[PDB]
Design a protein around this ligand. Structure first.
Ligand SMILES: Nc1ncnc2c1ncn2[C@@H]1O[C@H](COP(=O)(O)OP(=O)(O)OP(=O)(O)O)[C@@H](O)[C@H]1O
Ligand SMILES: OC[C@H]1O[C@@H](O)[C@H](O)[C@@H](O)[C@@H]1O
Length: 353
C-alpha cells in the first residue's frame, strides 16, 4: 500500500524511531467522508510527549492539520485526528448579502468542502443550532433571520433574558418575546395560524403555501420565522411558579404541535441550545426538527443528544466551525460571521413591501 510506504519514508526522514529502533507502524487510517476528519492510528515505542513535540514536523511531512494526538488503548498505541491539506475550509468567513438565495425559503449558513451549505425550509422546516457560550450559535440564527427578513418574512424572536440578545433594532423588524405569558400568547397563535393554513391547503388543493399564494391574489400568506435563543427557557420547567409551569407545559404542547405539522404551512422554528439535555432536546423536538447545527462539544453525551453521534468532540478548534446534520449524513462547515452592528440594517427590511 501507498500510505504505509509514504508514512515509512516520512518517518525514516525524521529518524522517528522508538526505544526498539523501529518506526511507527500504521494500524489503521479511518477517514470520515462527511466531516473529513481522518483517524490515523500507529503503534510505536515513542512516548506521546515525543509525538506532540513532532506535530509541526508531522503536519509538514504528511501534509495534514493535526487536530489532536491522544494515547490509545495501550501505552504503545497513539491516535491522530487530522484533516488532509486538500480538505480546504476557510478558518474565517464573513457574511455578504451576495449569498442571499433567490428561491424564497432557501437559506445559506456557511461554506463547506465542495460548496456552500443550503437549507430549503420547504424541505427541512426546522433548525436546531447548538454550541457552548461564544461558539457563535446565535450568529447563525441571526444570519438565517436576516436572509428571511430580506426574503420578506414575518419574524418572531424569543429571548427571556430581558430580550438583550434581540435589541431595539430587532424590535423594528418584528415581535420580540421576553416573558412566559407573551410566549404563551405567541405559541397559541402560531398553532392556530398553522392549523388555519393547514385547512387552506386542504380546501384549496395546494401542496404548500406557495401553491395557494398562486391561487389567491390579495390573500397571500407570508413565511413565519420564529427564532428561540435558548430552548431551555421554554423547556426547563425546574424552579418556576405553580401557575408558571402550567404555562411552560402549554408552550411545550404548542411547540411539539408546531414542529410536527408545519412542513407545508411555511412556519419555521430556529432554535438555539447552549446545554444539550434530554429534558430540553426531547425526542418530540428531535423527531420533528430535521436540521442540526453542532459546535465543538468536549463531551460525547452532549453530541449524541444533538447529532445522534459523537462527531462534535473531533471538531478543529476554529471560531465558527460547526457540524451540520440533515437526515443520515453529517458534514463539516464554517459558519458565516454575521456581525449585527455591520450587517443588520433594519430599515432595508422596512423598505420591503
Ligand atoms: N463564524 C464566526 N467566525 C468567526 N468568529 C466567530 C464566528 N461566530 C462567532 N464568532 C465570534 O464569537 C462570538 C460569539 O458570538 P455569539 O453570541 O453568536 O455566540 P453564543 O454565545 O454561542 O450565542 P448566544 O448569544 O445565543 O449566547 C462572536 O461575537 C465573534 O466574535
Ligand atoms: O403574538 C400574537 C399576535 O401577533 C401579531 O403579530 C399578530 O398581528 C396578532 O394577530 C397576534 O395576535
Amino acid at each position: 500500500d501507498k500510505r504505509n510506504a509514504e508514512y515509512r519514508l516520512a518517518f525514516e526522514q525524521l529518524n522517528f524511531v522508538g526505544a526498539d529502533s523501529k518506526t511507527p507502524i500504521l494500524k489503521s487510517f479511518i477517514e470520515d467522508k462527511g466531516t473529513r476528519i481522518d483517524e490515523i492510528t500507529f503503534e510505536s515505542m515513542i512516548p506521546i510527549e515525543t509525538w506532540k513535540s513532532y506535530i509541526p514536523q508531522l503536519q509538514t511531512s504528511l501534509n495534514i492539520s493535526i487536530i489532536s494526538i491522544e494515547q490509545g488503548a495501550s501505552k504503545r498505541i497513539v491516535i491522530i485526528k487530522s484533516m488532509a491539506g486538500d480538505a480546504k475550509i476557510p478558518k474565517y468567513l464573513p457574511w455578504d448579502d451576495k449569498y442571499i438565495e433567490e428561491q424564497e425559503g432557501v437559506v445559506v449558513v456557511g461554506q463547506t468542502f465542495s460548496g456552500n451549505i443550503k437549507i430549503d425550509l420547504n424541505k427541512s422546516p426546522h433548525i436546531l443550532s447548538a454550541g457552548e457560550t461564544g461558539s457563535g450559535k446565535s450568529v447563525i440564527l441571526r444570519c438565517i433571520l436576516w436572509q428571511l427578513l430580506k426574503q420578506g418574512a414575518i419574524a418572531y424572536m424569543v429571548d427571556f433574558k430581558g430580550g438583550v440578545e434581540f435589541g431595539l433594532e430587532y424590535e423594528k423588524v418584528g415581535q420580540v418575546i421576553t416573558e412566559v405569558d407573551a410566549a404563551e400568547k405567541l405559541f397559541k397563535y402560531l398553532v392556530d395560524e398553522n392549523a388555519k393554513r393547514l385547512k387552506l391547503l386542504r380546501e384549496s388543493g395546494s401542496k404548500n403555501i406557495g401553491e395557494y399564494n398562486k391561487k389567491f391574489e390579495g390573500e397571500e400568506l407570508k413565511r413565519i420565522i420564529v427564532v428561540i435563543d435558548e430552548l431551555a427557557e421554554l423547556m426547563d420547567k425546574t424552579g418556576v411558579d405553580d401557575e408558571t409551569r402550567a404555562k411552560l407545559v402549554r408552550i411545550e404542547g404548542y411547540t411539539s404541535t408546531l414542529a410536527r405539522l408545519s412542513r407545508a404551512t411555511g412556519i419555521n422554528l430556529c432554535i438555539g441550545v447552549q446545554r444539550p439535555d434530554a429534558k430540553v432536546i426531547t425526542g418530540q423536538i428531535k423527531n420533528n426538527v430535521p436540521v442540526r447545527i453542532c459546535g465543538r462539544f468536549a463531551d460525547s453525551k452532549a453530541s449524541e443528544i444533538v447529532l445522534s453521534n459523537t462527531k462534535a468532540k473531533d471538531l478543529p478548534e476554529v471560531k465558527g466551525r460547526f457540524l451540520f446534520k440533515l437526515g443520515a449524513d453529517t458534514v463539516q462547515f464554517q459558519a458565516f460571521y454575521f456581525d449585527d452592528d455591520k450587517h443588520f440594517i433594519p430599515n432595508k427590511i422596512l423598505k420591503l413591501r
